[PDB]
Amino acid sequence: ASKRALVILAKGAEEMETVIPVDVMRRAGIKVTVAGLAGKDPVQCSRDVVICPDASLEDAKKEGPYDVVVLPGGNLGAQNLSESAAVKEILKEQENRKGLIAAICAGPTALLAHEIGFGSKVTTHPLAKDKMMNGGHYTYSENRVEKDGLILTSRGPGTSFEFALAIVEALNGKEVAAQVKAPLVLKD
Template sequence: MPRLRESAQCGAEGGRAARVRAGVRSPSAWCGPFKHIKMASKRALVILAKGAEEMETVIPVDVMRRAGIKVTVAGLAGKDPVQCSRDVVICPDASLEDAKKEGPYDVVVLPGGNLGAQNLSESAAVKEILKEQENRKGLIAAICAGHYTYSENRVEKDGLILTSRGPGTSFEFALAIVEALNGKEVAAQVKAPLVLKD
């Protein structure tokens, strides 16, 4: 599980405390009773690069995990802590190199953030993963600066490509991924306790 930290140190006890404070580990602490949905697990790869937009990374990870999707947050530059666009530091679950060996994944997610998107676009490894995902007809989801085609729609799905506009659409983006992988009913079950405005 990625850990939100105020520093680049990701020690076991410090990481646990940061997860609890951030509500990542125990959503019931801030939004009432909640159970993760148990079902045949789909798998997601979230590629985390330096300069990624925090909300566009953490919100999809959280929402997908609530839906029972097995999410791997992979650090583009390795397993070291990654500094995001607003100085939040996230510890990846694995390096991209190691995560790739555990594939294939049902969805590959590309968070935005100007520097993060630039780092993703310059990576030969990311290009290879996306090409493989496209060839095997897997879902590719990108948000904000993580993609390049502009649309006024908050979330846009075109075949196996799902895109969204920015931090303010992160929940909709995440729920669209859940719906694409696990169906409308599961997406509705996950959405209900989030108290989102319709």
């Protein structure tokens, strides 16, 4: 009866955008797998924080399906996600089974690379807007969190808490999200 989340961690990922959703989701009782794109080895993030993944993406792929697939941001991390065929397969499969896909900051540009969710309303970091909008395949929003169908996007490191709580609300409902939120001492 336990919901399950896959967080894909690549070199150059924004470490705040990785750790906040992982932390918050586990506070919500979600079983989270931090999967290394390149393997089980430690991942150097964009600001040189080094995180040990729970598993390789290859192994995590075999233990699906996941209720949410989470793509952190970071410019170089998002580029690595955009170039990976394994990520394409995971995302297309998630789209087909109508599972939730969540991406933050530069992360959403990987959806464009893999032709995921065309026609959806999405947001990105302001610096990633032009890249995301190449071709006009999505409609752009400036909301701090945006959810359209099964696509949930957010803008930046400072929206990470709202991004993570939106995932919790989508998976576990509004009451659990409110319960998890109170001990965090968030402003709003």
